[PDB]
Every structure is written in C-alpha cells, then in structure tokens.
C-alpha cells in the first residue's frame, strides 16, 4: 500500500495532545480539499508571520496559548468570509451582491489605482501659474501648447473620486465583519466567565465598555459569532446566585423565560418584501455604527474620501492624497515606524529646548538688551529686546536655527564692558542647544533603528530552539538525524492545530468520536490543559520502543 | 575596455578608470558594502524628501507668493513663485541645501499679516527636512556598519561550538583534554571530505573497495545520508572502550 499512502498524504492531518489518561495521545483526521489549498495565501502567511512576532516579545508565557487560540478562531472567520466572494423589481437584489462580491474581491488593486491616479493628477497639477490678467489674480493653467491638457484634468478628477468611493464599499464588504466578530467574541467571554455586567461594572472609564451596554438586550446580539447560546449559557450560570428574572430582563429575551421551557405551541410570517422591511433593530444598528466610526483604518479612508470630495474646488487640495505613500510601499512603513517608535520621548526634547531658550532669553533681556539692534541704514530705529514676546521669538526663530549659535546675528562684542560675559553666553548657547540638544534627536533615531532590527533576531532565534508548543529545546530533538526538523513539521506543526478546530466546528456534535468530544468539552469550557506543554510523545515512550 | 579604447580621443576620458579603486584595495569593498547593504531603503528616503518638499511648495505658492522676490538693485523684476516648476525647483535646489532652512533666502517677515504663519512654515521646514530627514540618512549607515560587523561574530562563534558536520556541541567533546580541538582536525576535518571526492572520482569504478563504491552509489544517486549528522564514532563506542 504505497500509492494509497502517497495520494492521501497531503490530507491526513496529525495532532498530538494529552488528556483523559494522563499520557500523550495522537489524533488523525481528514484536513480538507480546499482549505489546504487556500492556506498558502500571502495575506494569510503574512498574518501568521505578524502574529508570531508579537508573541515572542510582547507575549506573556502564562497566556501564550490563550491568544494563540484567539488568532486561531479569527482565522476561521477569515476563511468563512473569504470563501464567499470567490466566484426587474426583485431580481436586482441578486445582481447587487453579484457585483459587490466582485468589488470586494480585487480590493487591493482598486486601492492601488487610487494612489496611481493621485500621482498622475499631482503631476499634471505642476503647471499652474498666477497671472494678473484673465487669459485680483487668476490661476491661469499654462501648458506646453497641446490644448488637450485642461479637459484631461476634469476626467481624471472625476475618476479619482469614483475609485475612492468604490474602495469604501469594498472595505465595508471585506473588513468590517472581521472587526465586528472580534468585538462580539471579546464581549461574549466577559459575561459567561466574568461578571463585567452582572457582578462587576465599568468604573465610569472604558468608553469602549460603556458603549456596549446598548447591545445587550437587542434581539440579535450574536450576529456574526458562532455560538448562539451565549444568552442561555450565562443565564443558568448566573441565574441562581443572582436574581433569575433580574438577569433575564438585562439581556432582553422578552417573555422568553417562560417560552424557553413552555414551548408546546408551534411557530407563518406573511410575505412582506418592501412592505415590512423597516422592522430592523434600531438599537443594534446604532451600536454597530458606533463601533465602525471608531476604527482607525475606516476613519483614514473617510478622510481620503473627504479630501477627494473637496476636490473639484481648489484642485490643489488633491495634493494631500500623495501622503498615501506611507500606508503603501511597505518599505516606508518600517522606516516611519523607526522614528515613530520613540515619539513619546521625541517631542519632549523639543519642549526641553523650548524651556532652555526661554531661560537664555530672560538673561539676554536683563543684561544684553542694547546689543540686538538690527543696525539699519544710517539709523538704529529697530531693537528686538524691548519686550519678552518680541525677543524670545527672535531666539526661537533665528537662534536655534542659526547654525553656529546666536552670536552671528548680534552686534560683535568688541567693547570693553561685559566682553567675557557675552562670550560665555555665546559659547554656552552653542554647546548646549546646538551640539548637545540637536544630538539627542539623532540619538533617539540611531538606536530606534537598532531596536526594530534587533527584535527580529529574537523571534528568529527562538523559533530555531523551541517548538513553540512544547517547551523542549532543539538539542534533545537533534539526537536523531533531522529530529528537530521533523518535530516542527509532523508532530507539532502549528498548522494542524489550525486544521483541527475547523474539523471540530464543522462536524456536528452527535458524531464526535471518543477523543474529539473531550477536547471539544474543554474548548467549550475554555481550558488549555490539552496542549502538550512539556512532553512530546517520544520523550514519553523513549524507554519502551524508540 | 571601452573607456580605454575611447581614449586617444578626449584623453580626459581616461579619468574614469580610476574608479577601479573600488574593486581593489579590499578595505574599500567592505566600506562600500556598508552603504550598499541598505541601498534598497536609502533612495526611497530621497523620494520621501522629494514628496515632502513638493507638499511645502504647494503651500508656499498659494499663500507666500509675494515673499520670494530676489530684490534686485533698486528694482524688483524677478520672482520665483510665479509658476510651479520654477518655484518647486527653487525649494529643491536651495531649500534643502540651505543649511538652516528656507528662511534664509526669503525676505524677512517683519510685516504684520501672516507673521506667525510664516514663522511656523519656517520652523516646521527646519525640523522636518533638515534635522529629521537628514538624520535617517545617517541612521541607515550607522547600523549598516553594525550589521556587517555583527554577522562576522556569529560565524566566528558557531565554529567554536559545533563541528559543522556533526551537530554535537563543544562541551561534550571537551570531556577529554583538547577533545574538541582534535575532533575538528582528525575526525571531521572538513578537508578530508575535500580529499575524498578527488580520491573517488580519479579512481576507476572497477577497483572500488567495499565501502568506496557504496558511498559512490549514493553520490551518483545524490543522497546525503552517509554524512554522520548526529554521531561521532566516540559517542557511538563510548561504553565499550573509550
């Protein structure tokens, strides 16, 4: 039986868990026919790479598994949402989604088209010219003859706005469900396992938690989450120690307390298309909008919306979309993250400089007043150190920017009195706010690059010593040839665990095998003791036969 | 070749072969590899600077047009902010190179209106495209040197712990005096393996010994299971006599 093994090999999953016997067991299952095909997508590989990076460095050891399972659940909803878009009065409804699924499909190319159009319109914008004569001053559009120059700008301006409108709808059809599912998952746990709304309450802070109180009693709370029993599950748990009707009225389910048990009566709604369609949860939709108007990416997309719209009026305003470069052209994001990594302590240096120059100004005003004359032609009618605001501004605007200290712009101290006090004032100013205080700015960047480059090495090195599931080092596995290489690809593959939750959820509860139900039992209970965490099934049976 | 040939005509053209220095004088190759190691992300900063100065130009053209007069002798016939190409070029050619920001070449804003808008425009320009954007250039070199110097340490350190053929660490071999020193020079010498393929290829296939043909068989088959990769013949027979 060779060909039968080779043909079925790419589908035979292999997971290694422990439990129900205080030993380590091994489970096999059928992975997929299409999920195995999709798993190798750049948006998924990059997502996994990013997830790995923020676990090794900003990840606690105790809760390492928990957030890994959270990302595991997230990828499943990504699978479900991505599996859909892939391909005269009531027939328009199907054709609408038949086009929306196309819009959300090639979202990234549509987005890149917006940047390209912004680049083109910016280039054509490079020919305006002021003129005090109609071809008050007019912004006459000069061109290298070639009359076809002005008509093109109008069509390009319209097309840019159209593409910018399309990408918003694409974003809505592509990313919004993910964030909604995220919030639903995060909220459902704080009720079943915590008393965030039952026993504890938000402490007048956490507007994110305060805003969620408007979704508890809606008829359809878990709209995107899988488990639809989140109400009944917490009802029993907190309905005895607390007021059963008190918990009932909080989560809604109007008259369902009796309808839960007394369901002897049966359940036909009349066909009311476009007649009773306005029967929607006015309280759930406002909550969804409140969540959606807080996401940063959607807000930036709306900002890009607003500037494009504010086009067709002072066309120059189009030259702000060019800053989309950043969120694009990857390279930059890393370069800009280098400087952004020390932002909290960068502007504070600017504040320190603003304080030090003020300190110098109070001295120059008290003693060096008669030196700052601008020495006009055959007259001295102007002096900068007459007030505080008009003198401190001089140091702030010319002093720090002098490139050589303030001593360049002041009249040369060739006089006798105060000859040394002025020289010390000049030299200290040069040594403090030009050499030192403009070196800390560079220092907060030189090591800023070093840290972003160094953190990568650690996540690279840790993956080459530990299995990230078991705590076993690489040496022990390297006892056999390529033992560690096989351990991270056959036994603890970090991808069969991906493929195991899909097998569990899709399978109905009735046909769960002896083991698959038990791990399902803890997964419902949210306990992570079934992961190996210490043993590897060959450290277990090394003595007997290995 | 081509430049030397194109000599005997405008002899000055000979002064391009001098750049052979690089591929020579070793030292340089390392120094130039330092800057070259970050080339993919160095010119992109220049592009970013070219974008930012354009962003500043669109503002200076719309509001600060009447400030850029060059103030000729007893007359004002020249202005730089009349078009886009002839004004953006001014910022690109004098602004970024001013060494002190654009505020040096423009007429001093001693007037009342726009007194603060011009000062903010000057200060932000100084703080963004002179201090910051000319510090990332130096940053992409300071750590560029550090990386080329650090990668050497790793290849130095790994050769002092593992045999590069066997995966065994140095400790275990250091059980006997100078055990690791002998392991990398007698048993897994990384140079006898050089001298073994020459012995195999030169020898005719007919006279291959019992073992030399078998390793030859996998070498023809291109399988690398005959390398030790885990054991060292003394971890193998330590119990019996060792």
Descriptors:
two-stranded antiparallel sheet, part of a larger assembly, Ryanodine Receptor, 4 strands, membrane protein, mainly alpha, Ryanodine receptor 1 (chain B), 2 chains
Instruction: Work out the largest interface and the residue count of each chain.
Output: A-B, 43 and 43 residues
Helix content of chain A: 40-55%
Shape call of chain A: extended
Oligomer: part of a larger assembly
Structural class of chain A, please?
mainly alpha
Order of neighbouring strands in the sheet with most strands of chain A = 1-2
Q: Give the termini separation of chain A.
A: 24 Å
Number of strands of chain A: 4
Order of helices and strands of chain A: HEEHHHHHEEHHHHHHHHHHHHHHHHH
- Strand fraction of chain A equals under 5%
Largest sheet of chain A: 2 strands, antiparallel
Rg estimate of chain A, integer Å? 34 Å
Helix segment tally of chain A: 23
What does this structure look like?
Chain A: The modification Phosphotyrosine is found at residue 372. The structure is cut from a larger assembly and holds 2 copies of chain A. With 546 residues, chain A is mostly helical. Chain A is built from 23 helices and 4 strands. In chain A, the strands form 2 sheets. In chain A, strands 1-2 form a two-stranded antiparallel ribbon. Chain A has a two-stranded antiparallel sheet with strand order 3-4. In chain A, helix 4 (64-85) packs across helix 22. The longest helix of chain A is centred in the first third of the chain and has 25 residues, at 150-174. The first copy, chain A, is extended. At the A-B interface, strand 3, helix 15, helix 17 and helix 19 of A face helix 3, helix 5 and helix 6 of B.
